[PDB]
Amino acid sequence: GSHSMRYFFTSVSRPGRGEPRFIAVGYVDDTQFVRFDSDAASQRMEPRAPWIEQEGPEYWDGETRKVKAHSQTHRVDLGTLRGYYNQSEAGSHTVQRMYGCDVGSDWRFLRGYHQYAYDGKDYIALKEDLRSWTAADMAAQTTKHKWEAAHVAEQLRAYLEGTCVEWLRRYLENGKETLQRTDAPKTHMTHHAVSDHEATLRCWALSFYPAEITLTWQRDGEDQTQDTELVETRPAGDGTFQKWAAVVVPSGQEQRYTCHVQHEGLPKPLTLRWE
């Protein structure tokens, strides 16, 4: 089906405690594949996925060069924004930037992204047309006008429609065993005595990839959304994800409840019952 490529960048100022902290990571779908951390010893872009570890020295030296350039525009950015907001030199501030692309099931270009946030709120974003900008703040307008005059969007559209999509599907065929895989959830239920008249039924989905999944409970085939405790899909640490959904069942009513699991790794969706 569809695929995406994304780069996330975070810079945090450390007033007095040295130069700003910069962290960069890249993902293809739910799999991280590269990182750069400013405080790390190597000062190089590093592999984080087995399939990218065999790219050449040209790749690694070129990406190290470009990621460090990104580090430095962000450290100028920290000053610029402190200026736009007439803020003190004493406080720590965060700039975040994300850009990347999506391809459809035919693997053709579908969406492109380029956006910034300052201290955790939207600052400026390239719109879907990849010809205009959304700036909310009055300070953000300097940036909007600047980038308009300088034709920033034209450079960005060019990359997002060309290079981004091109290397995404290079990564897709070069990492096909990982990226074109699908691990189906291993499911089970647990039953715990809450009291003399109630018990929790928890439905588990473990070891699945990709992270998207729908896990729901029903009582006689109807909605139980307000009545289900559902946790956030979490990483197991080995590249798969986990999730659970729980309902408190009145004693003697276990047979009324069903757990439903939808995941693209399943040949058909599961309906599970405690019995």
Binding site: Y7, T73, Q155
Partner: peptide
């Protein structure tokens, strides 16, 4: 592969 042109706010 990263974008290669500097952008400054």
């Amino acid at each position: 592969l990263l974008f290669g042109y500097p952008v400054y706010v």
